[PDB]
Amino acid sequence: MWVYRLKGTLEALDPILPGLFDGGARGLWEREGEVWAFFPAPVDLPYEGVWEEVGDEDWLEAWRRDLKPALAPPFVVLAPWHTWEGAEIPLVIEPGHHETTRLALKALARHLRPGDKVLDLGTGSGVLAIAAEKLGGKALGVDIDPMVLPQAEANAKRNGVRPRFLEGSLEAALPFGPFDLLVANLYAELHAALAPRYREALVPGGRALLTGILKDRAPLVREAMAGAGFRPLEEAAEGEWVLLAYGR
Ligand SMILES: Nc1ncnc2c1ncn2[C@@H]1O[C@H](C[C@@H](N)CC[C@H](N)C(=O)O)[C@@H](O)[C@H]1O
């Protein structure tokens, strides 16, 4: 579809809205002092607006503008353009929308202590590693996808913290361990296969916070973790998602 952009507010353009609808507009939106009228394709209109075809980037921008802060006690996840006047610890992330990220942030605040060394396995946007530094920990975020590293680095900087970010997985992290705590938002079968190496990555008394787990698959993780010598400490869920916390 195409947009016809006009300078002005809906209130000011009121006189010509009927004409835009007669001309076939199916949608209208006031967007920062401009009225955008949406059509299947350009048609002849006397209003002196400008036609432009709508693309995926326009959809992304519109969606972005509709984003609001997301609470994840003790944190609040904010888009770089959000302002927040609450008590919550801010976590600025270039567009924390998932249940699992939320479970992970709340669990992290409980199990992480100032001065703890943290491994955020499958760091992605770097949100967990960033929250760990904000809580007084020292974190390493690793991801097998090199492409996420630059955005993670940039989110860190926006948050005034500096975790270490590295391409790779668990084996790549070992030289920097052992760690006091590992947080891994992955999926149940992967946790199950890594259980033995999770034990190796942590110091005695260390903690493993596992999420990205569907309720129907929780059994797999309980079994592999018990099998690996971990003791369960806490469980929490949101929707169909579960976080399981263990001590080594
Ligand atoms: N085996 C693996 N080792 C390291 N990273 C992985 C592995 N498998 C998947 N990943 C990354 O794990 C991340 C999973 C994300 N859902 C987690 C992002 C972030 N930690 C969060 O809680 O929101 C993705 O960025 C994957 O690229």
Swiss-Prot record:
Biological process terms in GO annotation: methylation
Primary location recorded for the protein, binned into one broad class: cytoplasm
Annotated binding of S-adenosyl-L-methionine, by residue: T101, G122, D143, S169, N185
A Pfam family that the UniProt record links to this protein: PrmA
Record localization: Cytoplasm
Family label: Belongs to the methyltransferase superfamily. PrmA family.
Protein name: Ribosomal protein L11 methyltransferase
Gene: prmA
